[PDB]
CSV table of C-alpha atoms in Angstrom, one decimal:
chain,number,residue,atom,x,y,z
A,2,UNK,CA,0.1,1.0,16.6
A,3,UNK,CA,-3.0,-0.8,17.8
A,4,UNK,CA,-2.3,-3.4,20.4
A,5,UNK,CA,-4.6,-4.5,23.3
A,6,UNK,CA,-7.7,-5.8,21.4
A,7,UNK,CA,-10.8,-7.4,22.8
A,8,UNK,CA,-13.8,-9.3,21.8
A,9,UNK,CA,-17.1,-8.7,23.6
A,10,UNK,CA,-20.5,-10.2,23.2
A,11,UNK,CA,-23.6,-8.3,24.5
A,12,UNK,CA,-26.6,-6.2,23.7
A,13,UNK,CA,-26.8,-2.6,22.5
A,14,UNK,CA,-28.0,-0.3,25.4
A,15,UNK,CA,-29.9,1.7,22.7
A,16,UNK,CA,-30.2,2.1,19.0
A,17,UNK,CA,-26.9,3.0,17.2
A,18,UNK,CA,-26.5,6.8,16.7
A,19,UNK,CA,-25.4,7.6,13.2
A,20,UNK,CA,-24.2,11.2,12.8
A,21,UNK,CA,-22.3,12.7,9.9
A,22,UNK,CA,-19.0,14.6,10.0
A,23,UNK,CA,-18.7,17.7,7.9
A,24,UNK,CA,-16.1,15.8,5.8
A,25,UNK,CA,-18.8,13.3,4.8
A,26,UNK,CA,-17.6,10.4,6.9
A,27,UNK,CA,-20.3,8.7,9.1
A,28,UNK,CA,-19.8,7.8,12.7
A,29,UNK,CA,-21.7,5.1,14.5
A,30,UNK,CA,-21.8,5.2,18.3
A,31,UNK,CA,-23.3,2.6,20.6
A,32,UNK,CA,-22.6,1.1,24.0
A,33,UNK,CA,-22.5,-2.6,24.4
A,34,UNK,CA,-23.9,-4.2,27.6
A,35,UNK,CA,-22.2,-7.6,28.2
A,36,UNK,CA,-24.2,-9.5,30.8
A,37,UNK,CA,-22.7,-12.9,32.1
A,38,UNK,CA,-23.8,-16.5,32.8
A,39,UNK,CA,-25.6,-18.2,35.7
A,40,UNK,CA,-25.9,-21.5,37.7
A,41,UNK,CA,-27.9,-23.9,39.9
A,46,UNK,CA,-31.5,-21.0,39.8
A,47,UNK,CA,-29.4,-19.0,37.3
A,48,UNK,CA,-28.0,-15.6,38.3
A,49,UNK,CA,-27.0,-12.7,35.9
A,50,UNK,CA,-23.8,-11.3,37.2
A,51,UNK,CA,-21.2,-8.4,37.0
A,52,UNK,CA,-22.1,-6.7,33.7
A,53,UNK,CA,-19.7,-4.6,31.6
A,54,UNK,CA,-20.8,-1.6,29.5
A,55,UNK,CA,-18.4,-0.6,26.8
A,56,UNK,CA,-18.7,2.5,24.6
A,57,UNK,CA,-18.0,1.6,21.0
A,58,UNK,CA,-17.5,3.5,17.8
A,59,UNK,CA,-17.1,2.5,14.1
A,60,UNK,CA,-16.8,4.7,10.9
A,61,UNK,CA,-17.2,4.7,7.2
A,62,UNK,CA,-19.6,2.2,5.7
A,63,UNK,CA,-19.5,-0.3,8.5
A,64,UNK,CA,-20.9,2.5,10.6
A,65,UNK,CA,-23.9,3.1,8.3
A,66,UNK,CA,-24.6,-0.7,7.9
A,67,UNK,CA,-24.6,-1.0,11.7
A,68,UNK,CA,-27.0,1.9,12.0
A,69,UNK,CA,-29.6,0.4,9.7
A,70,UNK,CA,-29.0,-3.2,10.8
A,71,UNK,CA,-29.0,-3.2,14.6
A,72,UNK,CA,-31.4,-1.9,17.2
A,73,UNK,CA,-31.7,-1.6,21.0
A,74,UNK,CA,-31.4,-5.1,22.5
A,75,UNK,CA,-29.5,-6.7,19.7
A,76,UNK,CA,-27.0,-9.3,20.8
A,77,UNK,CA,-23.7,-8.7,19.0
A,78,UNK,CA,-20.2,-10.0,18.6
A,79,UNK,CA,-17.7,-7.1,18.8
A,80,UNK,CA,-14.0,-7.1,18.0
A,81,UNK,CA,-11.7,-4.1,18.1
A,82,UNK,CA,-9.0,-2.3,20.1
A,83,UNK,CA,-9.3,-0.7,23.6
A,84,UNK,CA,-8.6,3.0,23.9
A,85,UNK,CA,-8.1,4.9,27.2
A,86,UNK,CA,-7.8,8.5,28.3
A,87,UNK,CA,-7.0,10.4,31.6
A,88,UNK,CA,-7.8,13.8,33.1
A,89,UNK,CA,-6.3,15.8,36.0
A,90,UNK,CA,-5.1,19.1,37.8
A,91,UNK,CA,-4.9,20.6,41.3
A,92,UNK,CA,-8.6,21.5,41.7
A,93,UNK,CA,-10.4,18.2,41.4
A,94,UNK,CA,-8.5,15.1,40.3
A,95,UNK,CA,-7.8,12.0,38.2
A,96,UNK,CA,-10.6,10.6,35.9
A,97,UNK,CA,-10.3,7.8,33.5
A,98,UNK,CA,-12.4,6.8,30.4
A,99,UNK,CA,-12.2,3.9,28.0
A,100,UNK,CA,-13.6,2.9,24.6
A,101,UNK,CA,-13.5,0.3,21.9
A,102,UNK,CA,-12.6,1.2,18.3
A,103,UNK,CA,-14.6,-1.6,16.6
A,104,UNK,CA,-12.8,-3.5,13.8
A,105,UNK,CA,-15.7,-5.7,13.1
A,106,UNK,CA,-19.2,-6.2,14.5
A,107,UNK,CA,-22.1,-8.6,13.7
A,108,UNK,CA,-25.4,-9.6,15.2
A,109,UNK,CA,-25.2,-12.9,17.0
A,110,UNK,CA,-27.0,-16.0,15.6
A,111,UNK,CA,-27.1,-17.5,19.1
A,112,UNK,CA,-30.7,-16.6,19.8
A,113,UNK,CA,-31.8,-15.3,16.4
A,114,UNK,CA,-31.6,-15.4,12.6
A,115,UNK,CA,-31.1,-12.7,10.0
A,116,UNK,CA,-31.0,-12.6,6.3
A,117,UNK,CA,-27.7,-11.0,5.2
A,118,UNK,CA,-27.6,-8.9,2.1
A,119,UNK,CA,-24.1,-8.1,0.6
A,120,UNK,CA,-23.8,-5.0,-1.5
B,2,UNK,CA,-19.6,-16.1,35.1
B,3,UNK,CA,-16.5,-14.6,33.8
B,4,UNK,CA,-16.8,-13.5,30.1
B,5,UNK,CA,-15.0,-10.6,28.4
B,6,UNK,CA,-11.3,-11.5,28.9
B,7,UNK,CA,-8.2,-9.7,27.6
B,8,UNK,CA,-4.5,-10.2,27.1
B,9,UNK,CA,-2.2,-7.2,27.6
B,10,UNK,CA,1.5,-6.8,27.3
B,11,UNK,CA,3.3,-4.0,29.0
B,12,UNK,CA,5.4,-2.8,31.9
B,13,UNK,CA,4.6,-2.4,35.6
B,14,UNK,CA,4.2,1.2,36.5
B,15,UNK,CA,5.8,0.4,39.9
B,16,UNK,CA,6.7,-2.6,42.0
B,17,UNK,CA,3.8,-5.1,42.8
B,18,UNK,CA,2.2,-4.2,46.2
B,19,UNK,CA,1.7,-7.4,48.2
B,20,UNK,CA,-0.5,-6.9,51.3
B,21,UNK,CA,-2.2,-9.5,53.4
B,22,UNK,CA,-5.8,-9.9,54.2
B,23,UNK,CA,-6.8,-10.7,57.8
B,24,UNK,CA,-7.9,-14.1,56.5
B,25,UNK,CA,-4.3,-15.0,55.5
B,26,UNK,CA,-4.8,-14.6,51.7
B,27,UNK,CA,-2.3,-12.4,49.9
B,28,UNK,CA,-3.2,-9.8,47.3
B,29,UNK,CA,-0.9,-8.5,44.6
B,30,UNK,CA,-1.8,-5.2,43.0
B,31,UNK,CA,0.0,-3.5,40.1
B,32,UNK,CA,-0.9,-1.4,37.1
B,33,UNK,CA,0.3,-2.4,33.7
B,34,UNK,CA,1.3,0.3,31.2
B,35,UNK,CA,0.9,-1.0,27.6
B,36,UNK,CA,2.8,1.3,25.2
B,37,UNK,CA,2.5,0.6,21.4
B,38,UNK,CA,4.6,0.3,18.2
B,39,UNK,CA,6.2,2.9,15.9
B,40,UNK,CA,7.1,3.5,12.2
B,41,UNK,CA,9.3,5.3,9.6
B,46,UNK,CA,11.5,7.5,12.9
B,47,UNK,CA,9.5,5.4,15.3
B,48,UNK,CA,6.8,6.9,17.5
B,49,UNK,CA,5.4,5.6,20.8
B,50,UNK,CA,1.6,6.0,20.7
B,51,UNK,CA,-1.7,5.9,22.7
B,52,UNK,CA,-0.8,3.9,25.9
B,53,UNK,CA,-3.2,2.1,28.1
B,54,UNK,CA,-2.8,1.7,31.9
B,55,UNK,CA,-4.7,-1.2,33.4
B,56,UNK,CA,-5.1,-1.8,37.2
B,57,UNK,CA,-4.5,-5.5,37.9
B,58,UNK,CA,-4.9,-7.8,40.9
B,59,UNK,CA,-4.0,-11.4,41.6
B,60,UNK,CA,-4.4,-13.5,44.8
B,61,UNK,CA,-3.2,-16.5,46.6
B,62,UNK,CA,0.3,-17.9,45.7
B,63,UNK,CA,0.3,-16.4,42.2
B,64,UNK,CA,0.2,-13.0,44.0
B,65,UNK,CA,3.2,-13.8,46.2
B,66,UNK,CA,5.3,-15.1,43.3
B,67,UNK,CA,4.5,-12.0,41.3
B,68,UNK,CA,5.6,-9.8,44.3
B,69,UNK,CA,9.0,-11.4,44.6
B,70,UNK,CA,9.5,-12.0,40.9
B,71,UNK,CA,8.7,-8.7,39.2
B,72,UNK,CA,9.7,-5.1,39.6
B,73,UNK,CA,9.0,-1.7,38.2
B,74,UNK,CA,9.6,-1.7,34.5
B,75,UNK,CA,9.2,-5.4,34.0
B,76,UNK,CA,7.6,-6.3,30.6
B,77,UNK,CA,4.9,-8.8,31.2
B,78,UNK,CA,2.2,-10.8,29.4
B,79,UNK,CA,-1.1,-10.6,31.3
B,80,UNK,CA,-4.3,-12.6,30.8
B,81,UNK,CA,-7.5,-12.3,32.8
B,82,UNK,CA,-11.0,-10.9,32.8
B,83,UNK,CA,-12.1,-7.2,32.7
B,84,UNK,CA,-14.2,-5.8,35.6
B,85,UNK,CA,-16.1,-2.6,35.6
B,86,UNK,CA,-17.9,-0.4,38.1
B,87,UNK,CA,-20.1,2.7,38.0
B,88,UNK,CA,-21.0,5.6,40.4
B,89,UNK,CA,-23.8,8.2,40.6
B,90,UNK,CA,-26.4,10.5,42.3
B,91,UNK,CA,-28.0,14.0,42.0
B,92,UNK,CA,-25.0,15.9,43.4
B,93,UNK,CA,-22.1,15.3,41.1
B,94,UNK,CA,-22.5,12.5,38.5
B,95,UNK,CA,-21.4,9.4,36.6
B,96,UNK,CA,-18.0,7.9,37.1
B,97,UNK,CA,-16.6,4.6,35.7
B,98,UNK,CA,-13.7,2.4,36.8
B,99,UNK,CA,-12.2,-0.8,35.3
B,100,UNK,CA,-9.8,-3.5,36.4
B,101,UNK,CA,-8.4,-6.8,35.3
B,102,UNK,CA,-8.6,-9.9,37.5
B,103,UNK,CA,-5.4,-11.7,36.3
B,104,UNK,CA,-5.8,-15.4,35.5
B,105,UNK,CA,-2.1,-15.7,34.6
B,106,UNK,CA,0.9,-13.4,34.4
B,107,UNK,CA,4.5,-13.9,33.3
B,108,UNK,CA,7.6,-11.7,32.5
B,109,UNK,CA,8.2,-11.5,28.8
B,110,UNK,CA,11.2,-13.1,27.2
B,111,UNK,CA,11.0,-10.6,24.4
B,112,UNK,CA,13.8,-8.3,25.6
B,113,UNK,CA,15.1,-10.4,28.5
B,114,UNK,CA,15.9,-13.8,30.1
B,115,UNK,CA,15.0,-15.3,33.5
B,116,UNK,CA,15.7,-18.5,35.3
B,117,UNK,CA,12.5,-20.0,36.4
B,118,UNK,CA,12.3,-22.0,39.6
B,119,UNK,CA,9.2,-24.3,40.1
B,120,UNK,CA,8.3,-25.1,43.7
C,3,UNK,CA,-5.6,-8.9,10.0
C,4,UNK,CA,-3.9,-11.9,11.4
C,5,UNK,CA,-5.8,-14.2,13.8
C,6,UNK,CA,-4.2,-13.9,17.3
C,7,UNK,CA,-4.5,-16.2,20.2
C,8,UNK,CA,-3.3,-16.5,23.8
C,9,UNK,CA,-2.4,-19.9,25.2
C,10,UNK,CA,-1.4,-21.2,28.6
C,11,UNK,CA,0.3,-24.6,29.1
C,12,UNK,CA,3.6,-26.5,29.6
C,13,UNK,CA,6.5,-27.1,27.3
C,14,UNK,CA,6.3,-30.6,25.8
C,15,UNK,CA,10.1,-30.6,26.1
C,16,UNK,CA,13.1,-28.4,26.0
C,17,UNK,CA,12.9,-25.8,23.3
C,18,UNK,CA,14.6,-26.6,19.9
C,19,UNK,CA,17.1,-23.9,18.9
C,20,UNK,CA,18.5,-23.7,15.4
C,21,UNK,CA,19.8,-21.2,12.8
C,22,UNK,CA,18.6,-20.6,9.3
C,23,UNK,CA,21.3,-20.5,6.7
C,24,UNK,CA,21.3,-16.7,6.9
C,25,UNK,CA,22.1,-16.7,10.6
C,26,UNK,CA,18.7,-15.9,12.1
C,27,UNK,CA,17.8,-17.9,15.2
C,28,UNK,CA,14.7,-20.0,15.4
C,29,UNK,CA,13.1,-21.8,18.3
C,30,UNK,CA,10.5,-24.5,17.9
C,31,UNK,CA,8.5,-25.9,20.8
C,32,UNK,CA,5.0,-27.1,21.5
C,33,UNK,CA,2.6,-26.1,24.3
C,34,UNK,CA,0.2,-28.6,25.8
C,35,UNK,CA,-2.8,-26.7,27.2
C,36,UNK,CA,-4.9,-28.8,29.6
C,37,UNK,CA,-8.6,-27.6,30.2
C,38,UNK,CA,-11.1,-27.2,33.1
C,39,UNK,CA,-14.0,-29.6,33.9
C,40,UNK,CA,-16.2,-29.5,36.9
C,41,UNK,CA,-19.1,-30.5,39.0
C,42,UNK,CA,-18.6,-27.7,41.6
C,43,UNK,CA,-18.9,-29.1,45.1
C,44,UNK,CA,-18.5,-32.6,43.4
C,46,UNK,CA,-14.8,-32.5,42.1
C,47,UNK,CA,-13.3,-30.9,39.0
C,48,UNK,CA,-11.2,-32.6,36.3
C,49,UNK,CA,-8.9,-31.6,33.4
C,50,UNK,CA,-10.0,-31.7,29.7
C,51,UNK,CA,-9.1,-33.0,26.2
C,52,UNK,CA,-5.6,-31.4,26.2
C,53,UNK,CA,-4.6,-29.3,23.2
C,54,UNK,CA,-1.2,-29.4,21.7
C,55,UNK,CA,0.0,-26.4,19.6
C,56,UNK,CA,3.5,-26.2,18.1
C,57,UNK,CA,5.1,-22.8,18.3
C,58,UNK,CA,7.9,-21.0,16.5
C,59,UNK,CA,9.8,-17.9,17.6
C,60,UNK,CA,12.6,-16.0,15.9
C,61,UNK,CA,15.5,-13.6,16.3
C,62,UNK,CA,16.8,-12.6,19.7
C,63,UNK,CA,13.5,-13.7,21.4
C,64,UNK,CA,14.0,-17.4,20.5
C,65,UNK,CA,17.5,-17.0,21.9
C,66,UNK,CA,15.8,-15.9,25.1
C,67,UNK,CA,13.4,-18.8,25.1
C,68,UNK,CA,16.3,-21.2,24.5
C,69,UNK,CA,18.1,-19.7,27.5
C,70,UNK,CA,15.1,-19.5,30.0
C,71,UNK,CA,12.7,-22.3,29.2
C,72,UNK,CA,13.0,-26.0,29.5
C,73,UNK,CA,10.8,-29.1,29.5
C,74,UNK,CA,7.6,-28.9,31.5
C,75,UNK,CA,7.8,-25.2,32.1
C,76,UNK,CA,4.4,-23.5,32.4
C,77,UNK,CA,4.1,-20.6,29.9
C,78,UNK,CA,1.6,-18.1,28.6
C,79,UNK,CA,1.9,-17.4,24.9
C,80,UNK,CA,0.5,-14.7,22.7
C,81,UNK,CA,0.8,-15.1,18.9
C,82,UNK,CA,-0.8,-15.6,15.5
C,83,UNK,CA,-2.2,-18.8,14.0
C,84,UNK,CA,-0.5,-19.9,10.8
C,85,UNK,CA,-1.0,-23.0,8.7
C,86,UNK,CA,1.8,-24.8,6.9
C,87,UNK,CA,2.0,-26.9,3.7
C,96,UNK,CA,-0.4,-32.5,5.0
C,97,UNK,CA,-1.0,-29.0,6.2
C,98,UNK,CA,-0.9,-28.2,9.9
C,99,UNK,CA,-1.8,-25.2,12.0
C,100,UNK,CA,1.0,-23.6,14.2
C,101,UNK,CA,1.5,-20.5,16.2
C,102,UNK,CA,4.0,-17.8,15.3
C,103,UNK,CA,4.8,-16.3,18.8
C,104,UNK,CA,4.7,-12.6,19.4
C,105,UNK,CA,5.3,-12.7,23.1
C,106,UNK,CA,6.0,-15.5,25.7
C,107,UNK,CA,7.1,-15.8,29.3
C,108,UNK,CA,7.0,-18.3,32.2
C,109,UNK,CA,3.7,-18.4,34.1
C,110,UNK,CA,4.2,-17.3,37.7
C,111,UNK,CA,1.2,-19.4,38.8
C,112,UNK,CA,3.2,-22.0,40.5
C,113,UNK,CA,6.7,-20.5,40.2
C,114,UNK,CA,8.9,-17.4,40.8
C,115,UNK,CA,11.6,-16.0,38.5
C,116,UNK,CA,14.5,-13.6,38.4
C,117,UNK,CA,14.1,-11.6,35.2
C,118,UNK,CA,17.1,-10.0,33.6
C,119,UNK,CA,16.6,-7.2,31.0
C,120,UNK,CA,18.8,-7.1,27.9
D,3,UNK,CA,-9.4,-23.1,30.9
D,4,UNK,CA,-10.1,-23.7,27.3
D,5,UNK,CA,-8.2,-21.7,24.7
D,6,UNK,CA,-10.5,-19.2,23.0
D,7,UNK,CA,-10.1,-17.4,19.7
D,8,UNK,CA,-11.9,-14.9,17.6
D,9,UNK,CA,-11.7,-15.2,13.8
D,10,UNK,CA,-13.0,-13.1,10.9
D,11,UNK,CA,-13.4,-14.5,7.4
D,12,UNK,CA,-15.8,-15.9,4.8
D,13,UNK,CA,-17.6,-19.2,4.6
D,14,UNK,CA,-15.8,-21.7,2.3
D,15,UNK,CA,-19.3,-22.7,1.3
D,16,UNK,CA,-22.9,-23.2,2.5
D,17,UNK,CA,-23.0,-24.5,6.1
D,18,UNK,CA,-23.5,-28.3,6.5
D,19,UNK,CA,-26.4,-29.1,8.8
D,20,UNK,CA,-27.0,-32.6,10.2
D,21,UNK,CA,-28.5,-34.4,13.2
D,22,UNK,CA,-26.8,-36.7,15.6
D,23,UNK,CA,-28.6,-40.0,16.2
D,24,UNK,CA,-30.1,-38.4,19.4
D,25,UNK,CA,-31.7,-35.5,17.6
D,26,UNK,CA,-29.3,-32.7,18.3
D,27,UNK,CA,-28.5,-30.4,15.4
D,28,UNK,CA,-24.9,-29.9,14.2
D,29,UNK,CA,-23.5,-27.4,11.7
D,30,UNK,CA,-20.1,-27.8,10.2
D,31,UNK,CA,-18.4,-25.1,8.1
D,32,UNK,CA,-15.0,-23.6,7.5
D,33,UNK,CA,-13.9,-20.0,7.7
D,34,UNK,CA,-11.1,-18.7,5.5
D,35,UNK,CA,-9.4,-15.8,7.1
D,36,UNK,CA,-7.3,-13.7,4.8
D,37,UNK,CA,-4.5,-11.4,6.4
D,38,UNK,CA,-3.1,-7.9,6.0
D,39,UNK,CA,0.2,-7.0,4.2
D,40,UNK,CA,1.4,-3.5,3.5
D,41,UNK,CA,4.0,-1.0,2.3
D,42,UNK,CA,1.9,2.0,3.5
D,43,UNK,CA,1.9,4.6,0.7
D,44,UNK,CA,3.2,1.8,-1.7
D,46,UNK,CA,0.1,-0.7,-1.8
D,47,UNK,CA,-1.1,-3.3,0.6
D,48,UNK,CA,-1.7,-7.0,-0.1
D,49,UNK,CA,-3.5,-9.9,1.5
D,50,UNK,CA,-1.7,-12.8,3.3
D,51,UNK,CA,-1.2,-16.6,3.6
D,52,UNK,CA,-4.9,-17.3,4.2
D,53,UNK,CA,-5.9,-19.4,7.2
D,54,UNK,CA,-8.6,-22.1,7.0
D,55,UNK,CA,-10.2,-23.2,10.2
D,56,UNK,CA,-13.2,-25.6,10.3
D,57,UNK,CA,-15.9,-24.8,12.7
D,58,UNK,CA,-18.7,-26.8,14.5
D,59,UNK,CA,-21.8,-25.4,16.2
D,60,UNK,CA,-24.6,-27.2,18.0
D,61,UNK,CA,-28.2,-27.1,19.1
D,62,UNK,CA,-30.5,-24.2,18.2
D,63,UNK,CA,-27.5,-22.1,17.2
D,64,UNK,CA,-26.4,-24.3,14.3
D,65,UNK,CA,-30.0,-24.2,13.3
D,66,UNK,CA,-29.7,-20.5,13.1
D,67,UNK,CA,-26.4,-20.7,11.2
D,68,UNK,CA,-28.0,-23.0,8.7
D,69,UNK,CA,-30.9,-20.5,8.3
D,70,UNK,CA,-28.9,-17.3,8.0
D,71,UNK,CA,-25.4,-18.1,6.5
D,72,UNK,CA,-24.5,-19.2,3.0
D,73,UNK,CA,-21.4,-19.6,0.9
D,74,UNK,CA,-19.0,-16.6,0.9
D,75,UNK,CA,-20.6,-14.8,3.8
D,76,UNK,CA,-18.3,-12.7,5.9
D,77,UNK,CA,-18.5,-13.8,9.5
D,78,UNK,CA,-16.9,-13.1,12.9
D,79,UNK,CA,-16.5,-16.1,15.1
D,80,UNK,CA,-15.7,-16.5,18.8
D,81,UNK,CA,-14.9,-20.0,20.0
D,82,UNK,CA,-12.5,-22.6,21.5
D,83,UNK,CA,-9.7,-24.5,19.8
D,84,UNK,CA,-10.2,-28.3,20.0
D,85,UNK,CA,-8.1,-31.0,18.3
D,86,UNK,CA,-9.6,-34.2,16.9
D,87,UNK,CA,-8.3,-37.8,16.5
D,96,UNK,CA,-4.3,-37.8,11.7
D,97,UNK,CA,-5.4,-35.3,14.3
D,98,UNK,CA,-6.6,-31.9,13.2
D,99,UNK,CA,-7.4,-28.6,15.1
D,100,UNK,CA,-10.9,-27.2,14.8
D,101,UNK,CA,-13.0,-24.5,16.5
D,102,UNK,CA,-16.0,-25.2,18.7
D,103,UNK,CA,-18.1,-22.1,18.2
D,104,UNK,CA,-19.5,-20.2,21.1
D,105,UNK,CA,-20.9,-17.2,19.1
D,106,UNK,CA,-21.0,-16.3,15.5
D,107,UNK,CA,-22.7,-13.7,13.3
D,108,UNK,CA,-22.5,-12.0,9.9
D,109,UNK,CA,-19.9,-9.2,9.7
D,110,UNK,CA,-21.5,-5.9,8.9
D,111,UNK,CA,-18.3,-4.6,7.3
D,112,UNK,CA,-19.6,-4.8,3.7
D,113,UNK,CA,-23.2,-5.7,4.4
D,114,UNK,CA,-26.4,-5.0,6.3
D,115,UNK,CA,-28.8,-7.5,7.9
D,116,UNK,CA,-32.3,-7.7,9.4
D,117,UNK,CA,-32.0,-9.6,12.6
D,118,UNK,CA,-34.9,-11.5,14.1
D,119,UNK,CA,-34.9,-12.6,17.7
D,120,UNK,CA,-36.2,-16.0,18.8
């Protein structure tokens, strides 16, 4: 189905965690901190931390290509979930299923190596 | 600062709530339910409910132009917040500060009236 | 895999409605998006102005034809496509009148 | 107020680096985005292929020049702008190599 996609630019809060599923598929998890502009001065504002995940090869590349602090351009779709019941109440979580990710060449360089 | 914007299409979970601030400014709140495609059949999947808010005039127009069920195209920026402390723990909320919103002409018509 | 974009702007003129030889409806129109420029506390101004032509099909274009006219403010979500010289247009997925400076009485099908 | 878009694709060829008469660096390149087509359980295929030319300035274009070459897969975030006949290009805000089929050793400034 897909729908509702977003593009976010920010830095990894920590190194990408690459763990393997029993089926052989790799999963790369990382949260992206997107910290805004400035003015007059210059003031960092708001900030948005989004939990991301990517699989297969893309996941492995990511794991051995990015580290904590890396500024990246992320594209993917937004996924939400909700909780409940009469003894406590309503909780909401959200994540991004990354379609593509790359380190930003805004404040850095990098020598790419296709396979 | 801005940054991280999104565009979502969906239906209002309920009529837009228009309340007035003591300062005279109007606030329009509404949550958008974005329910996905299908196939083979046809299966509604995932679903994403996003709390939106718009002010000033745009807010008032919205309030007297849209109702529960209305299919709309929303554009704006994503805003997140986080909670905490040693007796309970971590909670996260998110909202969209609408820049522009309009009813969709995908499954309907509407006669617009500029002011 | 398509490249999607969202654009806000006004209709260069009344939407053009036609019918392919098969019967399918087709509406062509162009949106003029005018930018932001500032100085903040020293007067803002509008930008270069971007003109993107849009196409919409089936029962949706029939809705555009019926609701939108010249100079209407609209928000468009679609996919960039380039023709065959060779221009870049937008195949509309969703479109509706912006409620920024206007109200509207919607009517479901 | 600008119209922003995100595009994935490969570099039509090595990036073109030049310097305005003032000294500012400028990199021009074009991204070829190739779509998705399917049948699901009956073989998928790629689409029409969109070609958008991109420009990037200052110390960022100097980074593009140094990291990207012909055929590299990249993800671009920018703003649509139309020139003066009259074409539509993308003024890049951020760009980096897609890690879909490749790794990379980044190096902060």
